DNA sequence: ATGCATGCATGCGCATGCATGC
DNA sequence: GCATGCATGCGCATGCATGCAT
């Protein structure tokens, strides 16, 4: 080892070799130890799984290392650069000793993770330079691949001999003399015969959610190498484990003088997606290791019970009283509809997601529901009234930080792809901003045509909108359309519209007061697993009975809505019904859509608009 | 001219012979500094006044030289007071120990910083009056911080390792830009003439925290018809992370130029920050309008409170807002369109050091975990009103425009003033106070007598209960805010009833009434604040009764 | 001794904010 | 209640002049 360190190579190697065979955790449960016998050593089983599959990478938790011993953990945290190759060679030796004749592409590498989490980046000090650090953040920019040279190829002008030079300390010393003809300065570098590696630059936005008073959000720059390139996408919330670096800045490109103040930099070695509070992402849904057979059996047994649907509506948000219909609609939005493909038909993309609007007085808990949905669902975005512009959404023109690449930069709606976008104070939004939503809510695509840029982007986003009456009060003398004041085209694209009113019931007031005062003084993991399994396994289909039921429901809806004063019906609404039915099919884990789902969708649609209580010929609601 | 050896010896003996404070403070400080239990030492020039005062003048004239002399003296004194090894030693300590085990720059082995505190007899100056006469001297400046830069490392001493030898080369840095070395000046390489090339090392090199900040003059010291001037201050060492934008600070430092014109800057040494219902005794009446302000200042257990006062002109609403702004530690005051749009929320601006873009917040961002005051609320723009509503209901601001995509945390309590009701204010604000004026001869005479007494004696009329100063009120509020009471389970059966009947009454008065769960939440918050005022762990009935009375009085203002 | 990076306008393209006119 | 006219900041590229580090 280099001077200034107390790390001993042989001792660390022996310690890691012993640890890979001796470590056993009794507290580990089958909830996360999938396909591994807890009674047997864990990391040996992981190495066996690696041998079976052939993946040359192994993941090691830092907490396990600390539990085994503290000296090794401290040495690894302090000096990763020397410790990591020792771990790699020890793992390679053990793997080749236990499993001969195995075939791979290169030696096995080790990636540590779950080190001690720094609460805030701005709390770091120069003492922490070149140390292992873990971060939590959201990706907003990813650059293109950059090649970095590792070996250099040199050719002679006269004799044309082939030589190779390996980079050392980041600098390549080209030979000044030949090897066959001994001619001075006769060697020329060939770029295309060299060896290159991938490098990518990513940008993170930090949000530890426990910021001090008056602290603004922070932006961090990360660099990824090799296979880690393109493992994340913009809008994803990830945990990054890596190393902290400091790089000097030149005064100018053509002068060797550099500034005394250095530049911060971070190198990435590990990514983590799982979160203890949010739902599973799309990356996990494309794997088979998520669910153990016991949990699958438990979920299948639970799904057979009839009330589980309502049970789910009870388990969505226990902090908000009642509102069963709203919770059921939110659950149906979360499940979603069947994503059919219509490329051969020429009709184009078909929206399989549900958009929901909530209208009511300001003294309502719609904002709490929006905040809960935003915090619960990954890839969620939040906007409020006039704070967002038409150009703020979609994309806007910005130059590359170095050259004139004309780099389009994504907006809130694009970052909400395959996610949920919540809008509060939908009334204050201008017509220019609603013009974007007009295309987004239906075509699921955005067309951009500006100077030197012509492109189409995917905008598969489901929208939760909140609105208010004219005078912040629901005037009984005015009709629903008058109170809402929204265009028919905009309202027609919403699958469900929930009108929240105050009936002034004494029992309701007593219950609300009791719940609010008591606030002073199902398992989430089970719900997450059930939702993921339902969403990633079953593609519902509908039968003839559902067809006839939907036709009858459509004609009945048109007859009901023919009267003036109420919200009229359009053929598009019919499609909405189908989506809702499909959502119900995902609730019961049924691949076939039955009449029960259609009836439930019709009931929800009828109850959402309060059409039963509303006077059909005057448009005035009176309970 | 004078020899520096004698003055160095005088400093050394002063650091060892200042028992007259009874414990030997400097001995303990040196022991902590030698055992790596303290990383900063401050020297009082008022303490030096006991010794020869000529040293004080010399330091005030040539501060940097004497700072270096003090650093050298402390470094030389450190070995004497050492008793034991380092209990827990870090990477830099490991390098220092290894280097000692095996000339080295003094600052490389040094791991402490020294600073001077200005004498109390030295009167603070004004930013406008610091000029060429003060270059190189020690000055004290009082001002307001406007911009602060992020913390970044800065090189002090650079370490190079040779390609063909184990020798390590050290290069001190005393310039903003430095030229890296190439060839190895080691004796082995010089003798062999191998021509090895050096490589920089980040681990062996020494780094210090660096920060930029800007200060402006107070509005009181600005001359007639002029504009406040700005100054730039550099922060290094443990002084970092002390100053924040919007704070009133006092900084003692050195005035130095940068290279026959030159640009000036300041190097900081010390930075410092600058019934009970007696709010604004200058204003007669409004007895029931002052307890609400006290409860707003105390706050609930989200437990934020927002208050709006609507009134006819001439009842002096603005003075109460100004008093609230002055009393609160973190406070902002807005008059109208002069701070609209960019004044609130935040904006993106270039950096002084990094040369890139960073987000600077507005009045709402600065007033985080504080109190904000708005005057002429009805005249604000629609966007500002929507932002205020978002702050009141959600406590976070969402910005999504070209180049900006952020969510800012703003946990501030809003006090607003307005003239003459729209349903938005009733549905959103927790408390509305309508102040109406009607002519009464006796009240008019009393108010006129009070106003004339205020104008004549320049002080409020005396009474049985004397008011209190701002410092005592601030300390009392800080002490009160510590506790967090809890509502007992049984009292629910009371409170719920107190709610339900109330709403029933609101159902009887169909003319103009508004009730919801928001009123119950406001009642609970007020009761918790009142219980906190008594430092009681369990909320009592009297707090609930007082909160109900206050809410009824607010409602009974037509 | 010579060729180049930089300081100082200026056009280009754009978004954003304030005022008003139908 | 909203689109447009009139500044103004932002980010950028481009052209003209000059002053000296390799
Ligand atoms: N109750 C009062 N006691 C003492 N002075 C008062 C009172 N009401 C009004 N004043 C005086 O009248 C003036 C009102 O001016 P201002 O505070 O601008 O009114 P507003 O805030 O309503 O616009 C103040 O200077 C204040 O000295
Ligand atoms: Mg006033
Ligand atoms: Zn050759
Ligand atoms: Zn050497």
CSV table of C-alpha atoms in Angstrom, one decimal, chain B residues 288-558:
chain,number,residue,atom,x,y,z
B,288,UNK,CA,-58.4,42.0,22.1
B,289,UNK,CA,-56.3,42.5,18.9
B,290,UNK,CA,-53.0,42.0,20.7
B,291,UNK,CA,-53.5,38.5,22.3
B,292,UNK,CA,-54.1,37.1,18.8
B,293,UNK,CA,-50.7,38.5,17.7
B,294,UNK,CA,-49.0,36.9,20.7
B,295,UNK,CA,-50.6,33.6,19.9
B,296,UNK,CA,-49.4,34.0,16.3
B,297,UNK,CA,-45.9,34.6,17.5
B,298,UNK,CA,-46.0,31.6,19.9
B,299,UNK,CA,-47.5,29.3,17.3
B,300,UNK,CA,-49.2,25.9,17.6
B,301,UNK,CA,-47.9,22.3,17.8
B,302,UNK,CA,-49.2,21.4,10.7
B,303,UNK,CA,-49.5,23.9,13.6
B,304,UNK,CA,-49.0,27.2,11.7
B,305,UNK,CA,-51.4,30.1,12.1
B,306,UNK,CA,-52.4,32.8,9.6
B,307,UNK,CA,-54.1,36.0,10.6
B,308,UNK,CA,-55.8,38.7,8.4
B,309,UNK,CA,-56.9,42.2,9.6
B,310,UNK,CA,-59.5,44.1,7.5
B,311,UNK,CA,-60.1,47.7,8.5
B,312,UNK,CA,-61.0,51.2,7.5
B,313,UNK,CA,-58.0,53.5,6.9
B,314,UNK,CA,-56.5,55.5,9.7
B,315,UNK,CA,-56.8,52.8,12.4
B,316,UNK,CA,-53.1,52.2,12.1
B,317,UNK,CA,-52.9,48.6,10.9
B,318,UNK,CA,-49.4,49.1,9.4
B,319,UNK,CA,-47.7,50.0,12.7
B,320,UNK,CA,-48.8,46.6,14.2
B,321,UNK,CA,-47.3,44.8,11.2
B,322,UNK,CA,-44.1,46.7,11.5
B,323,UNK,CA,-43.9,45.9,15.2
B,324,UNK,CA,-44.5,42.2,14.5
B,325,UNK,CA,-41.8,42.3,11.8
B,326,UNK,CA,-39.3,43.9,14.2
B,327,UNK,CA,-40.1,41.6,17.1
B,328,UNK,CA,-39.9,38.3,15.2
B,329,UNK,CA,-36.3,36.9,14.8
B,330,UNK,CA,-36.9,35.7,11.2
B,331,UNK,CA,-39.3,38.1,9.6
B,332,UNK,CA,-40.1,39.8,6.2
B,333,UNK,CA,-42.3,42.7,5.5
B,334,UNK,CA,-43.9,43.5,2.1
B,335,UNK,CA,-45.7,46.7,1.1
B,336,UNK,CA,-47.1,45.8,-2.3
B,337,UNK,CA,-46.1,45.6,-6.0
B,338,UNK,CA,-42.5,46.7,-5.1
B,339,UNK,CA,-41.7,43.0,-4.2
B,340,UNK,CA,-44.1,41.2,-6.6
B,341,UNK,CA,-43.3,38.2,-8.8
B,342,UNK,CA,-39.6,37.6,-8.6
B,343,UNK,CA,-39.6,39.3,-5.1
B,344,UNK,CA,-41.4,36.2,-3.9
B,345,UNK,CA,-40.7,32.6,-4.9
B,346,UNK,CA,-37.2,32.3,-6.3
B,347,UNK,CA,-35.0,33.0,-9.3
B,348,UNK,CA,-31.9,31.6,-11.0
B,349,UNK,CA,-28.7,33.6,-11.0
B,350,UNK,CA,-25.0,33.1,-11.9
B,351,UNK,CA,-22.5,32.1,-9.3
B,352,UNK,CA,-19.5,34.2,-8.2
B,353,UNK,CA,-17.2,31.2,-7.7
B,354,UNK,CA,-18.4,28.2,-9.7
B,355,UNK,CA,-19.6,30.3,-12.6
B,356,UNK,CA,-22.8,28.3,-13.0
B,357,UNK,CA,-26.5,28.8,-12.1
B,358,UNK,CA,-28.0,28.5,-8.6
B,359,UNK,CA,-31.4,29.3,-7.1
B,360,UNK,CA,-31.9,32.3,-4.8
B,361,UNK,CA,-35.1,32.5,-2.8
B,362,UNK,CA,-37.4,35.4,-2.3
B,363,UNK,CA,-39.1,36.9,0.7
B,364,UNK,CA,-41.2,33.7,1.4
B,365,UNK,CA,-38.0,31.6,1.2
B,366,UNK,CA,-36.1,33.8,3.6
B,367,UNK,CA,-39.1,33.9,6.0
B,368,UNK,CA,-39.0,30.1,6.3
B,369,UNK,CA,-39.8,29.0,9.9
B,370,UNK,CA,-40.6,32.7,10.7
B,371,UNK,CA,-43.4,35.3,10.3
B,372,UNK,CA,-44.2,37.2,7.1
B,373,UNK,CA,-46.2,40.4,7.0
B,374,UNK,CA,-48.2,41.7,4.0
B,375,UNK,CA,-49.7,45.2,3.7
B,376,UNK,CA,-52.4,46.1,1.2
B,377,UNK,CA,-53.2,42.5,0.5
B,378,UNK,CA,-56.1,43.2,-1.8
B,379,UNK,CA,-53.9,45.1,-4.3
B,380,UNK,CA,-51.6,42.1,-4.9
B,381,UNK,CA,-51.5,40.4,-8.3
B,382,UNK,CA,-53.4,37.2,-9.0
B,383,UNK,CA,-50.2,35.1,-9.2
B,384,UNK,CA,-48.9,36.4,-5.9
B,385,UNK,CA,-52.3,35.7,-4.3
B,386,UNK,CA,-52.3,32.1,-5.7
B,387,UNK,CA,-48.7,31.6,-4.3
B,388,UNK,CA,-49.8,32.9,-0.9
B,389,UNK,CA,-52.8,30.5,-0.9
B,390,UNK,CA,-50.4,27.7,-1.8
B,391,UNK,CA,-48.1,28.7,1.0
B,392,UNK,CA,-51.0,28.9,3.5
B,393,UNK,CA,-52.6,25.5,2.6
B,394,UNK,CA,-49.7,23.3,1.5
B,395,UNK,CA,-46.6,25.1,3.0
B,396,UNK,CA,-44.6,24.4,-0.1
B,397,UNK,CA,-44.1,26.3,-3.4
B,398,UNK,CA,-44.0,24.5,-6.7
B,399,UNK,CA,-42.2,26.2,-9.6
B,400,UNK,CA,-42.1,24.7,-13.1
B,401,UNK,CA,-40.9,27.1,-15.8
B,402,UNK,CA,-38.2,27.3,-18.4
B,403,UNK,CA,-35.0,26.4,-16.6
B,404,UNK,CA,-36.7,26.0,-13.2
B,405,UNK,CA,-38.3,22.9,-11.7
B,406,UNK,CA,-38.2,23.0,-8.0
B,407,UNK,CA,-40.3,22.5,-4.8
B,408,UNK,CA,-39.3,25.0,-2.1
B,409,UNK,CA,-40.2,24.5,1.6
B,410,UNK,CA,-41.8,27.6,3.2
B,411,UNK,CA,-43.1,26.9,6.8
B,412,UNK,CA,-44.0,30.5,7.5
B,413,UNK,CA,-46.9,32.2,9.3
B,414,UNK,CA,-48.7,35.0,7.4
B,415,UNK,CA,-50.1,38.2,8.9
B,416,UNK,CA,-52.0,40.3,6.3
B,417,UNK,CA,-53.6,43.7,6.4
B,418,UNK,CA,-56.4,44.9,4.1
B,419,UNK,CA,-59.3,47.4,3.5
B,420,UNK,CA,-62.9,46.5,2.9
B,421,UNK,CA,-66.7,39.9,2.4
B,422,UNK,CA,-65.2,37.5,-0.2
B,423,UNK,CA,-65.4,33.8,0.5
B,424,UNK,CA,-61.8,33.1,-0.2
B,425,UNK,CA,-60.4,34.9,2.8
B,426,UNK,CA,-63.0,33.4,5.1
B,427,UNK,CA,-62.4,29.9,3.8
B,428,UNK,CA,-58.6,30.1,3.8
B,429,UNK,CA,-57.5,32.3,6.7
B,430,UNK,CA,-57.7,30.9,10.2
B,431,UNK,CA,-58.6,34.3,11.8
B,432,UNK,CA,-60.1,37.4,10.3
B,433,UNK,CA,-60.4,40.6,12.4
B,434,UNK,CA,-62.6,43.4,11.1
B,435,UNK,CA,-61.9,46.8,12.8
B,436,UNK,CA,-64.6,49.4,12.5
B,437,UNK,CA,-64.5,53.0,13.7
B,438,UNK,CA,-67.5,55.0,15.0
B,439,UNK,CA,-67.5,58.5,16.8
B,440,UNK,CA,-67.7,58.6,20.6
B,441,UNK,CA,-66.8,61.7,22.5
B,442,UNK,CA,-65.2,60.0,25.5
B,443,UNK,CA,-63.2,57.5,23.4
B,444,UNK,CA,-62.1,60.3,21.1
B,445,UNK,CA,-61.0,62.4,24.1
B,446,UNK,CA,-59.1,59.5,25.5
B,447,UNK,CA,-57.4,58.6,22.2
B,448,UNK,CA,-56.5,62.3,21.7
B,449,UNK,CA,-55.0,62.6,25.2
B,450,UNK,CA,-52.9,59.4,24.6
B,451,UNK,CA,-51.7,60.6,21.2
B,452,UNK,CA,-50.8,64.0,22.5
B,453,UNK,CA,-48.9,62.4,25.5
B,454,UNK,CA,-47.0,60.2,23.0
B,455,UNK,CA,-46.1,63.2,20.8
B,456,UNK,CA,-45.1,65.3,23.8
B,457,UNK,CA,-43.2,63.0,26.2
B,458,UNK,CA,-42.0,60.7,23.4
B,459,UNK,CA,-43.1,57.7,25.5
B,460,UNK,CA,-46.3,55.9,26.3
B,461,UNK,CA,-48.3,57.1,29.3
B,462,UNK,CA,-47.4,55.2,32.5
B,463,UNK,CA,-49.7,52.7,34.1
B,464,UNK,CA,-49.8,50.2,36.9
B,465,UNK,CA,-48.3,47.5,34.7
B,466,UNK,CA,-45.1,48.5,33.0
B,467,UNK,CA,-44.4,47.0,29.6
B,468,UNK,CA,-41.3,45.0,28.7
B,469,UNK,CA,-38.4,45.4,26.3
B,470,UNK,CA,-37.9,43.4,23.1
B,471,UNK,CA,-35.1,41.2,24.4
B,472,UNK,CA,-37.1,39.9,27.3
B,473,UNK,CA,-40.1,39.2,25.1
B,474,UNK,CA,-37.9,37.3,22.6
B,475,UNK,CA,-36.4,35.2,25.4
B,476,UNK,CA,-39.8,34.5,26.8
B,477,UNK,CA,-41.1,33.4,23.4
B,478,UNK,CA,-38.0,31.2,22.9
B,479,UNK,CA,-38.6,29.6,26.3
B,480,UNK,CA,-42.3,29.0,25.6
B,481,UNK,CA,-41.8,27.5,22.2
B,482,UNK,CA,-39.7,24.6,23.7
B,483,UNK,CA,-42.6,22.6,25.1
B,484,UNK,CA,-45.2,20.5,23.2
B,485,UNK,CA,-48.5,19.9,25.1
B,486,UNK,CA,-50.8,17.0,24.4
B,487,UNK,CA,-54.6,16.9,24.3
B,488,UNK,CA,-56.1,14.4,26.8
B,489,UNK,CA,-58.4,11.6,25.5
B,490,UNK,CA,-61.4,12.5,27.8
B,491,UNK,CA,-61.6,16.2,26.8
B,492,UNK,CA,-62.6,15.0,23.3
B,493,UNK,CA,-66.1,14.3,24.6
B,494,UNK,CA,-66.2,17.9,25.6
B,495,UNK,CA,-64.6,19.5,22.5
B,496,UNK,CA,-66.6,17.6,20.0
B,497,UNK,CA,-69.8,18.9,21.7
B,498,UNK,CA,-68.4,22.4,21.7
B,499,UNK,CA,-68.0,22.0,18.0
B,500,UNK,CA,-71.3,20.4,17.1
B,501,UNK,CA,-73.6,22.9,18.8
B,502,UNK,CA,-71.6,25.7,17.3
B,503,UNK,CA,-72.2,24.4,13.8
B,504,UNK,CA,-75.9,24.0,14.7
B,505,UNK,CA,-75.9,27.7,15.6
B,506,UNK,CA,-74.2,28.4,12.2
B,507,UNK,CA,-77.0,26.5,10.6
B,508,UNK,CA,-79.6,28.7,12.3
B,509,UNK,CA,-77.9,31.9,11.0
B,510,UNK,CA,-78.2,31.3,7.3
B,511,UNK,CA,-77.4,34.9,6.4
B,512,UNK,CA,-73.6,34.7,6.3
B,513,UNK,CA,-71.7,32.0,8.2
B,514,UNK,CA,-68.8,29.6,7.4
B,515,UNK,CA,-67.9,26.5,9.4
B,516,UNK,CA,-65.9,23.4,8.6
B,517,UNK,CA,-63.2,21.2,10.0
B,518,UNK,CA,-60.8,24.1,9.5
B,519,UNK,CA,-62.5,26.0,12.4
B,520,UNK,CA,-62.0,22.9,14.7
B,521,UNK,CA,-58.4,22.6,13.6
B,522,UNK,CA,-57.8,26.3,14.4
B,523,UNK,CA,-59.5,25.9,17.8
B,524,UNK,CA,-57.2,22.9,18.6
B,525,UNK,CA,-54.1,24.9,17.5
B,526,UNK,CA,-55.1,27.9,19.6
B,527,UNK,CA,-55.8,25.7,22.6
B,528,UNK,CA,-52.4,23.9,22.2
B,529,UNK,CA,-50.7,27.3,22.0
B,530,UNK,CA,-52.4,28.5,25.1
B,531,UNK,CA,-51.4,25.3,26.9
B,532,UNK,CA,-47.8,25.7,25.7
B,533,UNK,CA,-47.9,29.3,27.2
B,534,UNK,CA,-48.5,27.7,30.6
B,535,UNK,CA,-45.8,25.0,30.1
B,536,UNK,CA,-48.3,22.3,31.0
B,537,UNK,CA,-48.0,18.8,29.5
B,538,UNK,CA,-51.8,18.3,29.4
B,539,UNK,CA,-54.1,20.8,27.7
B,540,UNK,CA,-56.7,22.3,30.2
B,541,UNK,CA,-60.2,23.5,29.8
B,542,UNK,CA,-59.4,27.1,30.3
B,543,UNK,CA,-57.3,27.2,27.1
B,544,UNK,CA,-60.2,25.7,25.1
B,545,UNK,CA,-62.6,28.3,26.6
B,546,UNK,CA,-60.2,31.2,25.8
B,547,UNK,CA,-59.8,29.9,22.2
B,548,UNK,CA,-63.5,29.6,21.8
B,549,UNK,CA,-64.0,33.1,23.1
B,550,UNK,CA,-61.4,34.5,20.8
B,551,UNK,CA,-62.9,32.8,17.8
B,552,UNK,CA,-66.4,34.0,18.7
B,553,UNK,CA,-65.1,37.6,19.1
B,554,UNK,CA,-63.5,37.3,15.7
B,555,UNK,CA,-66.8,36.0,14.2
B,556,UNK,CA,-68.9,38.7,16.0
B,557,UNK,CA,-67.2,41.5,14.0
B,558,UNK,CA,-70.0,41.4,11.4
